[PDB]
Amino acid sequence: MNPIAVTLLTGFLGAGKTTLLRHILNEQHGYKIAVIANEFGEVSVDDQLIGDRATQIKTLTNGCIAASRSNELEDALLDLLDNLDKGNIQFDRLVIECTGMADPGPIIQTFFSHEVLCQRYLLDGVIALVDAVHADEQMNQFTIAQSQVGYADRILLTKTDVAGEAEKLHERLARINARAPVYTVTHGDIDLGLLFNTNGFMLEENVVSTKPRFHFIADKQNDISSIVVELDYPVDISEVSRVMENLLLESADKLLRYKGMLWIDGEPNRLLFQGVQRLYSADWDRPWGDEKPHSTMVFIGIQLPEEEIRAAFAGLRK
Amino acid sequence: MNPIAVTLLTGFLGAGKTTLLRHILNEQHGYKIAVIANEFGEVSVDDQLIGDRATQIKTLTNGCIAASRSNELEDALLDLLDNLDKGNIQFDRLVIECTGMADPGPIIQTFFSHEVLCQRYLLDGVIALVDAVHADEQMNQFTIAQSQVGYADRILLTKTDVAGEAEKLHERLARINARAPVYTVTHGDIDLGLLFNTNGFMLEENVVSTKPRFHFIADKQNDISSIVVELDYPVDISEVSRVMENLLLESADKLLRYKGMLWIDGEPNRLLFQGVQRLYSADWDRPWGDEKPHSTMVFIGIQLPEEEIRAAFAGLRK
Ligand SMILES: [Zn+2]
Ligand SMILES: [Zn+2]
Ligand SMILES: [Zn+2]
């Protein structure tokens, strides 16, 4: 068995998504993709079936699959599995549209809700589409516009050609999400392949992509931000375990995503961790070797108590 | 078998919730309540067990139960049932904390996710705690503050003694949520009884509590609002079914809650419906009798296309 790679496509509504979704559903791009979305529009349908849980599953002419969703995403996920195993449909990538006002959080959690889903589906990454022209206005008005960026493993920034100076926006995206690289497509369309193989849900040693700079006045502009913590000292495995558990429990409803690499006292291998809201996990990785040991952590969330968080880790110092 | 009454406690953080949560877990109030929350604080624990799904379940001195939760709410819900049926714990009410930045949406959906949950648990209502002093600022800054109010079946407005004439606030809450009655909590503690027995998730014929008035300028202050639709004409059951389905599909990520009573052409009984986001249901109810037939519907959501919605129902006119 090979796990189905799941991509979440998020961002505020725009014509850019439509062009991308149209390409997936219509062209002969060679990908075997199942798409879950609210509306599909004018698409060439080969066949159509209804799952045991009432999921409307259409097989398209290009070989891809278009599946509707109800309020329970589990039902679509399970109906897709049933019909895959029955040989009714064939796919190895799942793309879920969660644009507009959708919160990527509950969608991610669905994939960890049941053992069958944990085994048969494997989250690839969260892709955030960002319109350079309207992003600032959208993020100022709606918290969720920032949250979608905060959940992202990869940010696709479009329309910078017409928006003008993109850097002010580039800096804001980095303050919100210090994890995710920002891809700025100036000429041409978004390549479909840029949605895939982000490795966003694997343990990483390089948890920060855009190293934070010093801009105190503008750093407190967003409600969702990244806290980057760097330690040049090792910590006790029992102690840091307590700190994390207290931290995560304290800001449970505030935390979107968080990842880290830890220098553990007396241990020659890196300790990596990652989490989404309440769900977190950790494991050992590459040995330090000749590389200088250190800890790097990034916490992305809303109204996080940065002061307390930094103090908590500071107290781990002997 | 008799379903456990479930109360969702939401609203922005404060000492009011804290006192309320402290009161539930500590005082001898005569209620048999299980509480799911992130933090419980210092509470006198009688006994403690770990569920099969790793849920930490504590029995308190006042007879109440304190249960922890992970990222998967189902785990706690199922573990509570297991230990209830085994005779390890006893309760007939469940209170779930979803205050702060928490979204009541995914929590509500959990209770419809599986048959066992649908049969053993019965969602009674969503209670929104509102701080009269800080509510305006919070709702201006955070969409989720408005959303929590929009999901409510009952609104508890506290601290009006120090806020003063919170009449302006009354109107704003009513604009956001035309469904939910507002109770002004007098100086001091929120009484436990105010959380219970709303019957918020049953089909209702009296869907609107605060019948909307004309405040054209103020009606544009909020991102979440209620659309109240009144029809003095019967509609075709197939046609209004089409209108609703298109409406729901168009604003799927925007709709928080909606309820209605419908006058159906040729049918002597009221048709009642209710929904939360994508999940909706309808059934026939009390005959019209000598009472004048009419339709009343309320739609609560963010950036709803009121114009299109009203046009859609207008088009159902013969
Ligand atoms: Zn489930
Ligand atoms: Zn009033
Ligand atoms: Zn008084």
Side-chain angles (χ1 to χ4, degrees), chain A residues 1-12 14-16 18-31 33-41 43-89 91-114 116-160 162-164 166-167 169 172-205 207-210 212 218 221-238 240-279 281-289 293-318, chain B residues 1-12 14-16 18-21 24-26 29-31 33-37 40-41 43-89 91-114 116-136 138-164 166-167 169-212 215 217-219 221-241 243-279 281-289 291 293-317:
Chain A
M1 182 275 305
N2 217 277
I4 298 158
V6 183
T7 298
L8 305 188
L9 185 61
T10 189
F12 250 46
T18 307
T19 301
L20 178 61
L21 231 60
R22 183 184 314 267
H23 177 274
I24 292 179
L25 301 163
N26 294 290
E27 300 196 16
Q28 299 189 356
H29 44 63
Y31 288 103
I33 297 175
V35 178
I36 295 169
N38 302 331
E39 290 199 69
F40 297 106
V43 70
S44 307
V45 181
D46 262 21
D47 212 339
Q48 182 177 182
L49 64 90
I50 302 179
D52 297 340
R53 305 169 182 81
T55 303
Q56 193 177 57
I57 300 175
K58 308 183 182 200
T59 298
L60 312 178
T61 309
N62 68 344
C64 288
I65 308 298
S68 180
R69 63 155 301 185
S70 65
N71 226 144
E72 188 43 77
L73 186 57
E74 283 190 24
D75 293 348
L77 296 181
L78 295 175
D79 278 346
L80 285 170
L81 291 184
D82 291 331
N83 292 273
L84 184 66
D85 296 339
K86 286 170 180 168
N88 296 336
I89 59 184
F91 67 96
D92 46 42
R93 293 195 160 278
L94 176 61
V95 174
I96 301 180
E97 186 200 344
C98 42
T99 49
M101 300 293 179
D103 186 355
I107 299 186
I108 295 173
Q109 314 302 336
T110 303
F111 289 94
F112 298 87
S113 59
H114 299 274
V116 53
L117 302 178
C118 292
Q119 191 69 19
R120 298 298 300 276
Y121 289 100
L122 178 61
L123 269 171
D124 186 327
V126 176
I127 309 298
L129 301 188
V130 177
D131 185 326
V133 179
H134 300 294
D136 280 312
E137 298 166 317
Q138 292 163 345
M139 288 185 295
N140 290 346
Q141 288 197 351
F142 304 99
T143 305
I144 201 71
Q146 296 185 41
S147 292
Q148 291 170 349
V149 170
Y151 275 110
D153 297 286
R154 186 176 286 169
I155 297 167
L156 303 187
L157 185 61
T158 61
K159 305 162 86 191
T160 55
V162 298
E167 197 54 38
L169 181 52
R172 181 173 191 181
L173 294 173
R175 294 199 308 267
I176 291 171
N177 188 333
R179 275 195 65 235
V182 172
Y183 297 176
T184 303
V185 46
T186 64
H187 288 241
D189 299 38
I190 293 174
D191 302 331
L192 173 51
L194 291 183
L195 304 182
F196 305 140
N197 311 120
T198 75
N199 308 339
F201 283 79
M202 296 181 56
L203 297 168
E204 317 169 18
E205 63 178 60
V207 300
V208 178
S209 71
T210 309
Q221 179 189 12
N222 306 287
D223 277 323
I224 284 73
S225 66
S226 298
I227 303 170
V228 172
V229 186
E230 299 271 7
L231 317 177
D232 70 325
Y233 56 88
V235 295
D236 182 271
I237 191 166
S238 316
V240 72
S241 195
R242 165 186 282 184
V243 163
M244 284 294 298
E245 290 173 4
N246 295 340
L247 182 157
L248 300 179
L249 189 56
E250 190 77 13
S251 301
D253 290 324
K254 298 178 180 176
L255 282 159
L256 306 187
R257 290 185 73 179
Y258 44 97
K259 289 198 172 198
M261 175 180 62
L262 283 170
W263 179 8
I264 303 296
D265 207 335
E267 297 287 337
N269 300 282
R270 299 166 163 91
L271 178 68
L272 306 190
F273 70 87
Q274 63 178 335
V276 182
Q277 298 180 279
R278 288 183 173 89
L279 191 270
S281 67
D283 196 10
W284 300 98
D285 208 31
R286 195 160 64 125
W288 290 111
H294 65 293
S295 296
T296 307
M297 294 173 278
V298 55
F299 300 92
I300 304 171
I302 183 177
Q303 281 198 342
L304 292 185
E306 182 179 2
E307 320 79 30
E308 297 180 359
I309 292 171
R310 292 190 184 277
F313 287 110
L316 292 178
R317 195 171 212 141
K318 295 206 307 301
Chain B
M1 187 269 298
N2 219 316
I4 299 158
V6 184
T7 295
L8 304 189
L9 185 61
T10 189
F12 256 52
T18 307
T19 295
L20 179 60
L21 230 60
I24 294 178
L25 300 163
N26 294 289
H29 40 66
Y31 290 106
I33 298 175
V35 178
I36 296 169
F40 297 105
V43 183
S44 304
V45 186
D46 250 35
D47 204 343
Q48 179 188 192
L49 62 88
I50 286 81
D52 293 340
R53 304 168 181 81
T55 302
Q56 181 174 51
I57 301 174
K58 307 184 181 200
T59 296
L60 311 177
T61 309
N62 67 344
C64 289
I65 307 298
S68 179
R69 63 156 301 185
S70 65
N71 220 142
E72 189 42 74
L73 186 57
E74 290 188 28
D75 294 348
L77 297 181
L78 296 175
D79 280 347
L80 285 170
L81 291 182
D82 292 332
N83 291 273
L84 186 66
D85 295 339
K86 286 170 180 169
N88 297 336
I89 62 183
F91 68 98
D92 52 32
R93 289 178 180 276
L94 176 60
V95 174
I96 300 179
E97 186 200 344
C98 43
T99 49
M101 300 294 179
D103 185 354
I107 299 186
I108 295 173
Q109 309 305 325
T110 303
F111 289 94
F112 296 86
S113 58
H114 300 271
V116 53
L117 302 178
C118 292
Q119 299 185 9
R120 298 298 299 275
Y121 290 103
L122 177 60
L123 267 173
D124 172 76
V126 177
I127 311 299
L129 304 186
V130 180
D131 186 327
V133 180
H134 302 294
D136 281 312
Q138 292 163 344
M139 288 187 296
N140 290 347
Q141 288 196 351
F142 303 99
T143 307
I144 201 70
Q146 295 184 41
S147 292
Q148 291 170 349
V149 169
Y151 274 113
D153 297 286
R154 190 178 290 167
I155 297 167
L156 304 189
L157 187 62
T158 61
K159 304 162 85 190
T160 55
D161 62 330
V162 287
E167 178 60 29
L169 183 52
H170 287 185
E171 293 183 9
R172 182 173 191 182
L173 296 174
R175 292 194 310 265
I176 293 171
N177 188 332
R179 275 196 66 235
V182 173
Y183 296 85
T184 294
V185 169
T186 37
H187 54 107
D189 303 341
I190 306 181
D191 184 78
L192 285 206
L194 281 171
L195 302 169
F196 302 140
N197 311 334
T198 73
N199 296 312
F201 284 81
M202 295 181 55
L203 296 168
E204 317 167 17
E205 63 180 61
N206 192 38
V207 302
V208 177
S209 71
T210 310
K211 192 75 71 176
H215 300 104
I217 296 184
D219 292 330
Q221 178 185 34
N222 307 288
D223 278 323
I224 286 73
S225 67
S226 298
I227 301 170
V228 171
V229 188
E230 302 272 7
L231 316 177
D232 63 341
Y233 55 93
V235 297
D236 182 271
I237 192 166
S238 317
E239 300 182 10
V240 72
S241 195
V243 160
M244 284 294 298
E245 289 173 4
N246 295 340
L247 181 157
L248 300 177
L249 188 56
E250 190 76 13
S251 301
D253 290 323
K254 297 178 180 176
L255 281 159
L256 305 186
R257 291 186 74 179
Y258 44 98
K259 289 197 172 197
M261 177 180 64
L262 282 170
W263 181 9
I264 301 296
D265 209 335
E267 297 287 337
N269 303 319
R270 298 164 163 89
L271 179 67
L272 306 190
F273 70 86
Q274 64 177 335
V276 183
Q277 298 180 278
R278 288 184 174 89
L279 186 55
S281 66
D283 196 11
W284 301 99
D285 204 85
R286 195 157 71 99
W288 286 116
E291 298 184 22
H294 66 294
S295 296
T296 305
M297 293 172 278
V298 57
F299 300 93
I300 304 171
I302 185 177
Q303 281 198 341
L304 293 185
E306 183 178 1
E307 319 78 30
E308 297 180 359
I309 290 172
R310 293 191 185 278
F313 288 110
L316 292 178
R317 197 171 213 141

